[PDB]
Design a protein around this nucleic acid. Structure first.
Ligand SMILES: [Zn+2]
Ligand SMILES: [Zn+2]
Ligand SMILES: [Zn+2]
Ligand SMILES: [Zn+2]
Length: 215
RNA sequence: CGUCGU
């Protein structure tokens, strides 16, 4: 029960993804023990890839509401502050309607349910930016397929993601979806990078979503 | 002027 957090912390320390070989070069287990532990926690915690790689993930999500009334089993926090980027950490302190206490008692309890309470703020941020689609740039609501040319402000090119929103939440079931499931697209990667997500992070998001899509 | 906003 405590071994899973141990692994996650190391994965989160190394960008959220490590090869199985490189993982073994950090721990005191033979490959047989490690590999059977990853399978146990399941793909909602560790996504396994083909050399072999492991991608860290979690079901834990940040509440999307501006103001939320309990009950709610999501984390409640300022994403910006978690990333250390909220400009209202010092000067106003108010005018940010979101919690700057990452490890609040309500949050600590959510973290417990997802077996993440041993994580520091940096690891938690690493895990969430690649697991919680709420940390992604806005997805274009008018986008309808790459065989169209819809009004995303033609004279001012769309600054939003043109991908399938259902895919990002692991819920695309459309037989022959027309919306892109390809996050590694050049223009997507640019918006992603502008938003603070490197191509390495997007690749992890891509692989987590792919795993969820191949249900 | 689309959520988290010098
Ligand atoms: Zn909530
Ligand atoms: Zn804030
Ligand atoms: Zn668009
Ligand atoms: Zn889709």
């Amino acid at each position: 029960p405590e071994v899973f957090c141990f692994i996650t912390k190391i994965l989160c320390a190394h960008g959220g993804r490590m090869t199985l070989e490189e993982l073994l070069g950090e721990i005191s287990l033979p490959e047989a023990q490690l590999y059977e532990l990853l399978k146990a926690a399941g793909p909602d915690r560790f996504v396994l890839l083909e050399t072999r790689s492991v991608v860290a993930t979690t079901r834990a999500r940040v509440c999307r509401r501006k103001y939320c009334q309990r009950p709610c089993d999501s984390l409640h926090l300022c994403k910006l502050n978690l990333l250390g980027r909220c400009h209202y950490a010092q000067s106003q302190r108010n005018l940010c309607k979101y919690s700057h206490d990452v490890l609040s008692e309500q949050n600590f309890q959510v973290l417990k349910n997802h077996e993440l309470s041993g994580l520091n703020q940096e690891e938690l941020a690493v895990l969430l930016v690649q697991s919680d689609p709420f940390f992604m740039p806005e997805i274009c609501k008018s986008y309808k397929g790459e065989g169209r040319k819809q009004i995303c402000g033609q004279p001012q090119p769309c600054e939003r993601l043109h991908i399938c929103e259902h895919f990002t939440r692991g819920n695309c079931s459309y037989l022959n979806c027309l919306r892109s499931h390809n996050l590694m697209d050049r223009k997507v990667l640019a918006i992603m990078r502008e938003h603070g997500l490197s191509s390495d992070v997007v690749q992890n998001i891509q692989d987590i979503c792919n795993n969820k899509h191949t249900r």
